[PDB]
Amino acid sequence: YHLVDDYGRGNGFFDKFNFFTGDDPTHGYVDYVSRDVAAGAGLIGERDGRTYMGVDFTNPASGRGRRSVRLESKNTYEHGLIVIDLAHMPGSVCGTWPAFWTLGTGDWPYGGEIDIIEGVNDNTFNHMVLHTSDGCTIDNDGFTGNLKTSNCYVYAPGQDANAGCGIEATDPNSYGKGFNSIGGGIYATEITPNGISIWFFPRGSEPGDVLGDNPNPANWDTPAAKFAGGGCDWEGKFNAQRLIFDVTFCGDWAGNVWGIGGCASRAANCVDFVRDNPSAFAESYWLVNSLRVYAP
Numbered sequence: 275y276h277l278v279d280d281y282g283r284g285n286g287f288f289d290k291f292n293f294f295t296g297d298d299p300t301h302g303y304v305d306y307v308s309r310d311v312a313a314g315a316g317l318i319g320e321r322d323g324r325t326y327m328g329v330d331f332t333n334p335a336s337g338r339g340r341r342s343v344r345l346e347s348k349n350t351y352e353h354g355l356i357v358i359d360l361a362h363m364p365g366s367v368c369g370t371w372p373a374f375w376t377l378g379t380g381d382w383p384y385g386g387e388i389d390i391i392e393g394v395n396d397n398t399f400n401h402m403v404l405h406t407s408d409g410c411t412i413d414n415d416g417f418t419g420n421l422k423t424s425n426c427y428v429y430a431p432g433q434d435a436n437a438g439c440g441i442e443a444t445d446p447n448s449y450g451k452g453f454n455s456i457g458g459g460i461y462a463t464e465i466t467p468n469g470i471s472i473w474f475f476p477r478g479s480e481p482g483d484v485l486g487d488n489p490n491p492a493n494w495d496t497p498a499a500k501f502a503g504g505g506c507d508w509e510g511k512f513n514a515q516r517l518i519f520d521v522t523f524c525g526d527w528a529g530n531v532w533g534i535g536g537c538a539s540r541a542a543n544c545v546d547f548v549r550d551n552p553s554a555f556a557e558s559y560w561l562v563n564s565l566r567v568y569a570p
């Protein structure tokens with residue numbers, strides 16, 4: 275692998291993304307704002323060299339939701355290695371639904387979708403998921419995570435609508451609260467015509483070449499999640515992928531599972547909570563040390 279795109283930091287970093295302002299596709303109680311508004315609301319910026327991207331934790335919400343940002347990269351990649359080093363990620367905050375993921379070109383889910391970092395509410399473990407068109411199942415081996423669903427098809431017969439094929443990390447510091455308590459870590463995602471692999475290196479355990487110019491995933495520890503096998507035409511299920519950063523609220527996942535999890539005691543429903551308790555979302559922010567993409 276050789277470097278092809280270093281996102282840098284601060285404004286140079288944001289220059290490489292488009293700010294999504296449309297209604298939330300996942301129907302969350304969120305108000306995605308433009309770059310200027312976000313900048314004017316302290317939603318984006320730099321923090322001691324780290325790139326900051328958060329949500330409104332000051333004002334009571336109104337309109338379509340609590341303000342946040344959803345960044346989608348201008349550049350796209352189809353084969354390569356995506357390495358993100360985070361000092362902080364949106365916390366395990368009730369009502370929130372953060373995600374660092376990739377989305378293919380064309381109509382979803384035909385171009386494929388890779389959720390590298392995702393979770394909802396007070397989740398402890400991270401979920402790594404693939405969302406694809408029909409005809410793509412993965413094998414159960416080659417990774418340290420716990421396999422939940424093996425059919426990547428968004429409307430797979432035996433799984434919840436759009437659960438996709440998901441693998442749950444076993445390290446409680448792989449997401450939100452625990453992740454932030456150790457100062458974060460690194461998530462490396464490899465896309466090849468033979469499958470996808472995702473490695474999570476908690477702060478201090480990353481290999482010597484992961485942040486360098488010529489990383490070689492071949493000599494690394496077993497990945498946390500691996501999607502491969504003859505049950506999928508890996509090449510055809512995924513096309514050029516663009517990177518996406520976002521934090522939504524409630525909606526199809528977080529909002530739907532609000533009443534059965536540990537947040538049910540915060541309020542009758544997710545929206546009421548997110549609307550009236552701004553101070554609860556102070557931890558809902560990303561803090562990027564670096565974002566680099568490589569190619570074979």
Ligand SMILES: OC[C@H]1O[C@@H](O[C@H]2[C@H](O)[C@@H](O)[C@H](O)O[C@@H]2CO)[C@H](O)[C@@H](O)[C@@H]1O
Pocket residue numbers: 389392401403434435436437438440526527528530531
């Ligand atoms: O992971 C199990 C969980 O899946 C939920 O569907 C989510 C999916 O997990 C997520 O990766 C994707 O981005 O959004 C879909 C739709 O919200 C499902 O709603 C849950 O019931 C299920 O427990």
Ligand SMILES: OC[C@H]1O[C@@H](O)[C@H](O)[C@@H](O)[C@@H]1O
Pocket residue numbers: 299300377382
């Ligand atoms: O934003 C990417 C896609 O995400 C999916 O979860 C939504 O259902 C689609 O409508 C949307 O196009």
